[PDB]
Amino acid sequence: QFAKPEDAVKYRQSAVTLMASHFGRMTPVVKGQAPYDAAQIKANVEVLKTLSALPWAAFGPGTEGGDARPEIWSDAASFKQKQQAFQDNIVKLSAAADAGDLDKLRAAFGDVGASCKACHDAYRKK
Amino acid sequence: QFAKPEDAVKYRQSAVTLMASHFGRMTPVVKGQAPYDAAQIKANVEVLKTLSALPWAAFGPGTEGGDARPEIWSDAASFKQKQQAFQDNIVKLSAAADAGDLDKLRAAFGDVGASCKACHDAYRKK
Ligand code: HEC
Ligand code: HEC
């Protein structure tokens, strides 16, 4: 869907920006600093689920640029693995949110955050 | 969810960037320059539906900046009207996509694009 590779860069940066906001805005809730409203979180995690699927299609072939390391393309199977692990952890977070269980939500949230960091440590230019 | 108003600006710009891509990527399909796959479009319009709800909450009070005109806040009822008309037209586009009907899709797509433009003409700094 991108006329030029820069367009893919701008898309994926916007997608991870929105993902980061929908993930990170729950930090005060997981920590107990903000109240836990099960329906609020269920709805937010549904948004995060949609968003978390979107960046990966904007790392198509020839879309090198931004802060993506070139390893994303030369090691396509390792990157796909990191994306799928991340989205599988999103599935666990959805299940926690849908169950309305703050303890499960906390655990799942920390697993998702670790899978964000693991991808960045390997595939994001510092 | 925004620590500073700039964060709201960066969110809403990313949200409308993603919305614009999910809308505009269908242009070749509506024009017949690319094939029409009903399931492909249904799924894309589901993504667009989610995204089209997201910018508006990032124009909260005190979040003046970017290319938003100040009129968004002083005329809150007129802006809300423009957002709701836009999202109602998104509902019509979802119904067309869910029906698998290219003629209805075409019509609905042009209504959505007109409601993008109408908001920009009043509320987006040139
Ligand atoms: C790989 C499988 C990733 C996962 C999982 C997550 N992110 Fe990431 N992110 C990744 C890359 C390769 C990049 C660089 C993109 C580019 O072309 O520049 C990023 C970038 C970010 C950013 C910065 C965006 C900006 O516009 O500056 C943020 C804020 C970010 N990523 C956040 C983030 C979060 C919170 C994640 C899990 C919920 C997450 N990312 C996962 C690769 C990958
Ligand atoms: C008001 C009810 C709007 C509707 C409907 C749409 N958009 Fe818009 N858009 C609006 C504003 C106020 C702004 C400025 C935001 C800011 O703070 O800077 C925008 C901006 C855009 C942009 C530019 C984003 C950038 O990062 O440069 C694009 C590409 C854009 N909008 C696209 C777009 C499309 C395609 C729409 C319908 C599908 C649409 N917008 C509707 C306000 C409103």
Author numbering:
A (entry chain A), B (entry chain A): 1 to 126
Q: Which sentences from the paper describe this structure?
A:
All of the tertiary structures are similar to wt AXCP and only salient points concerning the heme region are discussed here. Ferrous structures show the different residues at position 16 to lie over the heme in a similar manner to that of Leu16 in wt AXCP with the exception of L16A where the side chain is essentially truncated.
Cytochromes c′ occur in methanotrophic, denitrifying and photosynthetic bacteria and have proposed roles in protection against nitrosative stress, NO trafficking during denitrification or pathogen defence. All cytochromes c′ have a 4 α-helix bundle structure containing a heme centre with a solvent exposed proximal His ligand and a buried hydrophobic distal pocket with a non-coordinated residue (Leu or Phe, rarely Met or Tyr) in a position to exert steric influence on the binding of diatomic gases. Unusually, cytochromes c′ are able to utilize both heme faces (distal and proximal) as a means of discriminating NO from other diatomic gases. In order to understand the factors controlling distal versus proximal NO coordination, we have examined NO binding to AXCP variants in which the occluding distal residue Leu16 is replaced with residues that are smaller (Ala, Val), of comparable size (Ile) or larger (Phe).
